[PDB]
Design an enzyme around this catalytic site. Structure first.
Site, PDB file in Angstrom:
ATOM      1  CB  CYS A 191       3.185  -1.372   1.621  1.00 11.32           C
ATOM      2  SG  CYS A 191       4.790  -0.714   0.904  1.00 11.32           S
ATOM      3  CB  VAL A 222      -2.242  -0.050   0.229  1.00 10.93           C
ATOM      4  CG1 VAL A 222      -3.385   1.205   0.431  1.00 10.93           C
ATOM      5  CG2 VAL A 222      -1.505   0.292   1.766  1.00 10.93           C
TER       6      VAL A 222
END
Ligand code: ICS
Ligand code: ICS
Ligand code: CLF
Lengths: 476, 522, 522, 477
Positions: free
Chosen positions: B152, B156
């Site tokens: 993740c 991002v």
């Protein structure tokens, strides 16, 4: 021999591109106990090289999985997307007594389960609402911690303001922890972040409260996470010796006993790596001395009990010798049964930040030799302690790669390997007995006199198991 | 203390009186514990309908989820390719967890690398990690292919996977010909099944997107099979066995069964078996492509239909009798191959077992959870057995999946008491099995804590867990089992009826109280 | 009373207060029952070593045997032959029981006739019963062969089977050429396995005794396989699978797996599959003959070696790792076929499973019973797993066999606490599991009453039953499973370790008492 | 199906037989005629089975040990002879009881003399004497021993009567010799009769001169209910709600003392006529105790039985009878309302032993079902007398049906449901015909009484209407 171990290191390094070769060389060493500073022989606590299959975890594992997760009457939120808290749900055997879901919450997975809207607009509103829901649905919790996952610091959320504002609104303790996995290089920085969070948000709540009365014998067990009950088989020896264990950090730990710890007379540090930070803080702020000890095997446990008792008066020293006399027939019976089955056997270890050196004496109490050891995330001061514990010309490896470890094993041909779950099934297929030295392979405790019996039983049952003579088919 | 010839581990060591006394002193002295009367009172409240209503009013808190995140599925997908190293661009903590999670379910090594993006990469992007990572991985572990997914953090900060990989080849970190398919796999979208779909579509594109001019549908006379996220070894094997039995040419796209089941013969094999690159390059020449788990293969379907121009048939997961029937008939129609007598007999043996066991299965009430295709197939088979699915939970399900399962329920009288829940977790389910108690749960190892909770209310409230699904961590070798086809239906049936008979034996074992019904013959 | 929406069968209906009160008044009013304190005192005595000493002094009373009688085995042998009707010359009550006994274990039809000898036959012999019986059976059920065994009445009165059948042909009740093999199967000699041995030897004699001039060993390049009394369908299947995997030509002599597993497809098939008559007539032309359960094939062995002149190899039952190894190697030596890579890999997967589960299996203590070859093979595998077989009971075993099993125990340290019992029954074994408690029993359904007895003394005394053997009446479809070969070893291993882990979960399910050790991961 | 079609069905099935078996089996097959006053003019029964035809019958030992004696819970029953008979019959019959098994009750245990060849050659009387001593030592709470003779005992000339007499006098224990060897008779039926006589001669008179039991005018005994799945308990509860006192149950959940108290009751209530009419007739002759037949299958027959029973007592029992009928009326009305629409018009074929082939017909009719064929393994003329009245005209009757006959009858008649035994069950499931065991109740029950009718209805629906019966034909066939 030393020259043969050095040639082994050099031959394994040949597979690497130049950049990785030059770096991995600094992390591999032949032991030299006479050297005064370990950084002159081996480098540690650096970034992992990309793509080499390190065994390390992240700062969230060091904070949520290791330090905060075991605290049993608080609720810990894995804050961010769903993965981190699911993979770490109940994987670590930090044992506790409690009514899970009612007054204790260790094996549950609470999470804010971030979706894309949370990444784009921020999760602070969700965190506020999640806290209200926790309070309604788990009214007996005694505090909440917020364990930040990777995106929290990346998207710019302010969990500290949420914890201050909500904590004031509901008169509850809410601990923001900035242990996002991209911080640091391993579990280690997570320990440190977690220690600072205890210091800043919990440890001082009773600084002005003088209702608890100390005794001269008050201690706290610092850095024992009660794997398989390790801390309980430690605590029983300390209180048989006449001390009062006010707190356990953090296996089977409650938030109140953490808040009572600045009232103890001596901090007993088992895991130096994960908890030396808060021990130093309590010495500076409260004047509480701390000391390292070791409860693996009879030699170290006896050593530790006597060193600890020597900090107290004649009655504790007397009770110490009475404890040692009580258990001498018990561990001598363990040695007499199991040492003849294990004598001369050689073991290689690879673990986290304490056990790769702390279990050495226990193996030596069974006549076994530790011929190679290493750590995922230890620092120089851990290796300072390791080179004194390991024999000359043994092999040391920091942040070992999957490839190095397999090649080291193939050349050295140990009789037993002690490491983790990602290692276990590799080395069984090679015909090499393997014991999990994180989870204790679902056995334990291994701490103390009662743990030594189980440790000895376990090494024997695996090293000498009949299955290891059956791997080659008789027609091949 | 220990008696050396009967050594006690944690259980039952800590039940010794001196340990019990010590733990009572720790509690009373320093834990400031709530009184047991209050603990009992709160526990009882969490079993009530009042608590359930508050529980189901949650909007922000998730408790005990029944899903994982995308890259776990990408790793499993990648493992089914020959000599292929899963490689997750991002932070290394993820890969430690992915590997451990699969280690504990399969009891096998799980190989997977990270490129160890840290706070420096957070500030300046992860391009250097990808360059050095690809070179180091290829040099050290010598894969034929590196399948790239993402954590993740990498999503991002917005790392351009394609540009990073292109630059790695341009600047010479890996050869230009070396296959590096990739996929973005954000943990904050969908679930682990979505990562499998995304990774598979990425690999399919890598080998066929720019090479379609030369291909003709049906020219290789095979049928492509895409299994999806699958953690039973028997499921890979039963599909291959049934197609071989029919004489049907097939290609199974992502086949990790060999690398998840290497023998213990003295040597460690980092890679074994797997779908070949040539199979992926040639897959557009198949007659058609069948998706075994269509409800999480929707990106793959769009590509297979859009680019390969395959008329992907509308088949459910081949679970139970009806849907195994439909699977075989469609394969026969596509391939032109008849269904052989051996499979017709196997079918008749399943039906025979259904007639044998129907009196014990009839009306039995189940709570169950899992991934969408697995859950709907279990629901279907339960209806075929005359059981009542009552609580059907799919944390990662969606609204049109729920509509499909509701229609399956409405078509059988045994569905009358069933409710489908999506986006709910195992703390929601725990409430349901207290307020509307079923006979059993069917689910993964996380279910054991619900069973523990129900027993604490009382033996008459206990809901035993039947372990089918993923992950199963607290029993050994159930990953070897089968849930698809007639063979899986037989295994499930046998487990369900003997779970019923085991529990009845437990309840009738009390001498001169309940053992009048402790029958030798059932 | 009944609530129409929640009907109660006997359990739990009779726990209702009005039923409980009625049963109390029946006991007090009319049963003259011993006081419960006396019942408790006597039960406790039956668990002592004093009682065990008296128990083991029995010379005349047998209680809860672990054996059946000869013709039961003859019927099962006969069923493995193509279109063959088992026919038991004697009294009809026997055949009702044989059929029902097998009905309940296999959940299949079991076809078998009697010739219904009554008092009239007791006085004047059963010759007319054989004449009319053979004609009636052949005309009504149209078998291709009728395999004749005997009940104890026909043995005691001394019916001359050979003369009766010969006269049935001489007087035209059946054609002279219709095959009627026979065997005497006295229930007061040996056990059910002996009847299997006698029936097979009679069938082999019927087809080869007067035909030997034409035969030459090895001329058909096959290996004969004789399975013995076998009640797991998977065992017939795995032997045929492994031999075909090796490319070994073979003939399984007595093969009931088809007729014990017909599909439910709308038609009842009285006969299916089976060893053909030509296969028995040609069997002397085999390379050799392998006996899978030699400890109850002694009469068969004497005929195969003395008349067919086959050098039958000294193989143990192929159970566990070492003995499956030795079976494959001997088959390879005889056939000249190498052991293929698929079986070598299967072997390695079993060893992998042994490395995976060895820590939970180590030191686990077992009581077990069954037929001699089964029991010996189970003992050997337990030793290979690092388990301790403490109480080994074989009611129909003999002193030669006991010597062999004692030597197997003496060759492993895990045998140091084992004792072998022959001619003892399940009431003996009940005493052993009280006075020297093991962790589990491995046995057939009759074991459930021992588990019930151990629990009545207290939960910490309970010895759970693991169901492996014959008969298994109180679970469904376990007869489909496997105990031979690597496949059966994997199945047994998985059952054993998951029995251990199920019980540990039961022992650690108590919240705030024992659930500190209720681990998600094992 | 017309009477003529049924007669032709019988003749067509019979053509397969040799002449001797054809002529015999013809006598045992019939189209019902309720108007014929004596059933022996229409069907023959209680004859030897024809050899080789796969009869479904058992033996006299099954009738004595398995049926009548085995259930008596506080006695120990020895299966005397070789090992087989007692092993195949261990706990196969669900005659339920309350007790501590192995301590004061012994029903599901297998005691045997496990004859070897030396016992055949030299006799088993000495071994039986030693076995009895061993039983007394290891099972001190037993209240009597029965010796259940298997085939060899009377063939080898053993004298178990003298053993039972000498040992019974030595140890002052009741020891009952039973000559129920399997070669006697032609079926289970003679085993019943031998067992009834053994009770008569060795147990039933033992309190003839003990007047200490306190009688009441409402004392009854349940005769011939073996408590399958609890059947006798769900009957007893109704009799006692009606104000009667059930002194004894023969023999389900039965104790030896209540058998010994039975000659003190005022009325013997006979359920199973076949197995127990003999001792009922004896008790009327010797003690003057009247007996009556009754039927607790389904609401129609249960209500009719309660009223017929209560009519033999005073107005107070008759009043309580109507109070019981009113209590259970909404309960069985709710069962019919739920289950009759699911079963109406469905057609059943039955084949059982000596009572249920006629006794359960009313229960099926209470659910709208029709019994289109029925038959018995071992019934007698008086049983068929009662059957022809209960079955519809032109239905099919079969005595001691052969496996071949029953399969052919089923293929022609195509019933919706078959009710029979374990040896029949798995044949007819393969053919796609719902099947319910009507001996063992398919491990369900009770079926007797009001509480049993709910379970009966649920069970017939769950199996007849099960989804598995739609699935036997593969869609590509
Ligand atoms: S905390 Fe640390 S990796 Fe000191 S992160 Fe790790 S339960 Fe290890 S070597 Mo798992 S520094 Fe504890 C540890 Fe040691 S989780 Fe446990 S075994 S003694
Ligand atoms: S005793 Fe008889 S065969 Fe009347 S031997 Fe048989 S438990 Fe049947 S039709 Mo099994 S005369 Fe009872 C009987 Fe009926 S064993 Fe049961 S069901 S009502
Ligand atoms: S290094 Fe550590 S474990 Fe990794 S994410 Fe970061 S805090 Fe967490 Fe989490 S949800 Fe899945 S497992 Fe990752 S991609 Fe994100």
């Amino acid at each position: 021999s030393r020259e043969e171990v050095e040639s082994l290191i050099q031959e394994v390094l040949e597979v690497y591109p130049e950049k990785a070769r030059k770096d991995r060389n600094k992390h591999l060493a032949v032991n030299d106990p006479a050297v005064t500073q370990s950084k002159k022989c081996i480098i540690s606590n650096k970034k992992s090289q990309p793509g080499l299959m390190t065994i390390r975890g992240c700062a969230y594992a060091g904070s949520k999985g290791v330090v905060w997760g075991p605290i049993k009457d608080m609720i810990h939120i894995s804050h961010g997307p769903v993965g981190c808290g699911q993979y770490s749900r109940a994987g670590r055997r930090n044992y506790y007594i409690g009514t899970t879901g009612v007054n204790a919450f260790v094996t549950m997975n609470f999470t804010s389960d971030f979706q894309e809207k949370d990444i784009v607009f921020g999760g602070d509103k969700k965190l506020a609402k999640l806290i209200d829901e926790v309070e309604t649905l788990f009214p007996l919790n005694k505090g909440i911690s917020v364990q930040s996952e990777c995106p929290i610091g990346l998207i710019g959320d302010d969990i500290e303001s949420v914890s201050k504002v909500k904590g004031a609104e509901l008169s509850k303790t809410i601990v923001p922890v900035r242990c996002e996995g991209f911080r640091g290089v391993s579990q280690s920085l997570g320990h440190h972040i977690a220690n600072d969070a205890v210091r800043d948000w919990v440890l001082g709540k009773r600084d002005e409260d003088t209702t608890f009365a100390s005794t001269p014998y008050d201690v706290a067990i610092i850095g024992d996470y009660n794997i398989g009950g390790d801390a309980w088989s430690s605590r029983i020896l300390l209180e048989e010796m006449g001390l009062r264990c006010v707190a356990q950090w953090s296996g089977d730990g409650s938030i109140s006993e953490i808040e009572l710890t600045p009232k103890v007379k001596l901090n007993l540090v088992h895991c130096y790596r994960s908890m030396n930070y808060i021990s130093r803080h309590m010495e500076e702020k409260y004047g509480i001395p701390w000391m390292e000890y070791n409860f693996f095997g009879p030699t170290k446990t006896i050593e530790s009990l006597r060193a600890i008792a020597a900090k107290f008066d004649e009655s504790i020293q007397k009770k110490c010798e009475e404890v040692i006399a009580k258990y001498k027939p018990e561990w001598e019976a363990v040695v007499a049964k199991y040492r003849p089955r294990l004598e001369g056997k050689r073991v290689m270890l690879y673990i986290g930040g304490l056990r790769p050196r702390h279990v050495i004496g226990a193996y030596e109490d069974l006549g076994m030799e530790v011929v190679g050891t290493g750590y995922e995330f230890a620092h120089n001061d851990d290796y300072d302690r390791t080179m004194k514990e390991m024999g000359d010309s043994t092999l040391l490896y920091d942040d070992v790669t999957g490839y190095e470890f397999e090649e080291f094993v193939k050349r050295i041909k140990p009789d037993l390997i002690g490491s983790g779950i990602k290692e276990k099934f590799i080395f069984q297929k090679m015909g090499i007995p393997f014991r999990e030295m994180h989870s204790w392979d679902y056995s334990g405790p291994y701490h103390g006199f009662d743990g030594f019996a189980i440790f000895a039983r376990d090494m024997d049952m695996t090293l000498n198991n009949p299955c290891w003579k059956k791997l080659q088919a008789p027609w091949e | 203390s220990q008696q050396v010839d009967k050594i006690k581990a944690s259980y039952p060591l800590f039940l010794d009186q001196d340990y019990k006394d010590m733990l009572a002193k720790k509690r009373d002295g320093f834990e400031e514990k709530y009184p047991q009367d209050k603990i009992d009172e709160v526990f009882q409240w969490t079993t009530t309908k009042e608590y359930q209503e508050l529980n189901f009013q949650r909007e922000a808190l998730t408790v005990n989820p029944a899903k994982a995140c995308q890259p776990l599925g990408a790793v499993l997908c990648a493992l089914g390719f020959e000599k292929t190293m899963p490689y997750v661009h991002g932070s290394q903590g993820c890969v430690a967890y992915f590997r451990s999670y699969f280690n504990r379910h399969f009891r096998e090594p799980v190989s997977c690398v990270s490129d160890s993006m840290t706070e420096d990469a957070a500030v300046f992007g992860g391009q250097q990690n990808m360059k050095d990572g690809l070179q180091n991985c290829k040099a050290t572990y010598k894969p034929d292919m590196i399948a790239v997914s993402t954590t993740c953090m990498a999503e991002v900060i917005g790392d351009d996977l394609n540009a990073f990989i292109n630059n790695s080849k341009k600047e010479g970190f890996i050869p230009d010909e070396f296959p590096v398919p990739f996929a973005h796999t954000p943990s904050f979208v969908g679930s682990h099944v979505t990562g499998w779909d995304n990774m598979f579509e990425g690999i399919a594109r890598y080998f066929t997107l720019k090479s379609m001019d030369d291909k003709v549908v049906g020219s290789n006379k095979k049928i492509n099979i895409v299994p999806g996220f699958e953690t039973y070894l028997g499921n890979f094997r039963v599909i291959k066995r049934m197609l071989s039995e029919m004489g049907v040419g097939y290609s199974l796209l992502s086949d990790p069964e060999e690398v998840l089941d290497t023998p213990a013969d003295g040597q460690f094999r980092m890679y074994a078996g797997g779908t070949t690159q040539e199979e992926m390059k040639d897959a557009p020449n198949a007659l058609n492509t069948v998706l075994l788990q269509p409800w999480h293969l929707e990106k793959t379907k769009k590509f297979v239909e859009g680019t390969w121009k395959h008329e992907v048939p509308k088949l459910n997961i081949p679970m139970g009798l009806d849907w195994t029937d439909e699977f075989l008939m469609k394969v026969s129609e596509i391939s032109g191959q008849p269904i052989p007598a051996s499979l017709t007999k196997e079918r008749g043996r399943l039906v025979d077992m259904m007639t044998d066991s129907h009196t014990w299965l009839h009306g039995k009430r189940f709570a169950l959870w899992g991934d969408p295709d697995f859950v709907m197939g279990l629901v279907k088979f339960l209806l075929e057995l005359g059981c009542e699915p009552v609580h059907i939970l799919c944390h990662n399900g969606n609204k049109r999946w729920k509509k499909a399962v509701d229609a399956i329920l409405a078509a059988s009288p045994y569905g009358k008491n069933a409710t489908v829940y999506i986006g709910k977790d195992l703390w929601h389910l725990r409430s349901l099995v207290f307020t509307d108690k079923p006979d059993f749960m069917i689910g993964n190892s996380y279910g054991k804590f619900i069973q523990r909770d129900t027993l604490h209310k009382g033996k008459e409230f206990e809901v035993p867990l039947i372990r089918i699904g993923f992950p199963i961590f607290d029993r050994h070798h159930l990953h070897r089992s089968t849930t698809l086809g007639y063979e899986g239906a037989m295994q499930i049936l046998t487990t369900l009826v003997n779970s019923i008979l085991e529990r009845l034996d437990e309840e009738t074992r009390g001498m001169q109280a309940t053992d009048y019904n402790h029958d030798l013959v059932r």
